[PDB]
């Protein structure tokens, strides 16, 4: 059982990174949250100066609600930011896995490689085809018909070709 | 019974090979099963975005 | 468009 020492330490220390953008995430969406509510707040109070007769009023209910809606959006967007961040770190840690687990693979495959070298694949086949070809050569010599033929025909097939004639004749 | 031992120490370091690509493959697909669920949810909010009259 | 049609 292997202690990865400092792979530990490492996913301890992206560990506390990883919470401390998500904490200050969480406060930002709270923060969000609120500014939201704010602006809800001013949009009635902008109703309510434009039923009561003071346009004026409206103007700035409106005006103070225009002003909390950017804020809100700048709250939004330093929060998607922040997500961004945090799926740039658990990226790079699944990066780094898979360059781990392909350079282990390519050390295997190497070792391999190594041991059965392609010379040594064509060595083989080489030897492979001389045998064959060497067996053909002698399971041939062995098989000439010029021993149980042994003494042919003078007249060369003459008297055979005659007896054919008279076989096929009967 | 001849002991092969190169050929056994060999075996166990492809097997460890083999374990650590098949558990980073795992892993990936597990990462491409949510994503494909957080497709679909965005999906799902461009609906209701189109719905409620915000394009 | 592709929503929006569906």
């Given at each position: 059982?292997?202690?990865?020492?400092?792979?530990?330490?490492?996913?301890?220390?992206?560990?506390?990174?990883?919470?401390?953008?998500?904490?200050?995430?969480?406060?930002?969406?709270?923060?969000?949250r609120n500014l939201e509510r704010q602006s809800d707040e001013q949009k009635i109070l902008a109703s309510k100066m434009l039923k009561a007769?003071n346009k004026?009023g409206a103007r700035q209910a409106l005006k103070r609600r225009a002003v909390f809606m950017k804020r809100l959006?700048?709250?939004?967007?330093?929060?998607?930011?922040?997500?961004?961040?945090?799926?740039?770190?658990?990226?790079?840690?699944?990066?780094?896995?898979?360059?781990?687990?392909?350079?282990?693979?390519?050390?295997?495959?190497?070792?391999?490689?190594?041991?059965?070298?392609?010379?040594?694949?064509?060595?083989?086949?080489?030897?492979?085809?001389?045998?064959?070809?060497?067996?053909?050569?002698?399971?041939?010599?062995?098989?000439?018909?010029?021993?149980?033929?042994?003494?042919?025909?003078?007249?060369?097939?003459?008297?055979?070709?005659?007896?054919?004639?008279?076989?096929?004749?009967?």
């Open positions: 059982m292997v202690k990865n020492w400092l792979f530990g330490k490492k996913r301890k220390e992206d560990a506390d990174a990883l919470a401390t953008l998500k904490g200050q995430q969480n406060r930002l969406q709270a923060e969000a007769g004026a959006n700048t709250v939004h967007n330093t929060a998607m930011n922040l997500q961004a961040q945090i799926d740039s770190i658990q990226t790079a840690t699944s990066t780094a896995e898979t360059v781990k687990a392909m350079e282990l693979g390519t050390k295997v495959v190497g070792e391999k490689i190594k041991t059965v070298s392609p010379e040594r694949t064509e060595r083989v086949m080489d030897s492979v085809m001389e045998q064959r070809d060497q067996i053909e050569m002698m399971t041939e010599a062995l098989s000439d018909p010029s021993l149980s033929e042994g003494i042919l025909d003078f007249e060369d097939d003459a008297a055979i070709d005659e007896q054919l004639a008279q076989l096929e004749a009967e």
